[PDB]
Amino acid sequence: SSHTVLLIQTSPRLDSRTWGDYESVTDALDALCKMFEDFLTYDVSQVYEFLDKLSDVSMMIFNRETGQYIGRTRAWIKQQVYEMMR
């Protein structure tokens, strides 16, 4: 499991920036999917749209080889959601 920071900005307001820390990527993705379900029985396209509607979403995922964090973009997160709902 890789320590993961989820960075979110819900609206164009810069004071809408929030974050959470998770023991694993799967835990972070689970938290993201809960935000979607709360806003919403659904198709994967609706999850993509929910992610597109956030002003910002990204993850920082710990890499045990370097001891540093890899930044992952919204497109990488959509690909993880795609693979979870195959």
Place this chain on the structure above:
Amino acid sequence: TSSHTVLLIQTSPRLDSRTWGDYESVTDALDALCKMFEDFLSVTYDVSQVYEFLDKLSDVSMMIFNRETGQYIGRTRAWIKQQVYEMMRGR
């Protein structure tokens, strides 16, 4: 030579006090913390007061882009305190 920096903050025990900022350099992120320290005091103080403010935040950390690897170094509160001191004193 500037490095993109994400500042992660939780000001109080409230989970909803978490926020983050994006900065073009470490200097700009450190100055955000200096401005928070000043705005809490709202400029005559001692270094123990800057450290006290940083210690009383519920959480504070930085993620700093590292050109050598393309990845982000997580810096802890203790490192941030030393860097705030050095930048205020003058490098």
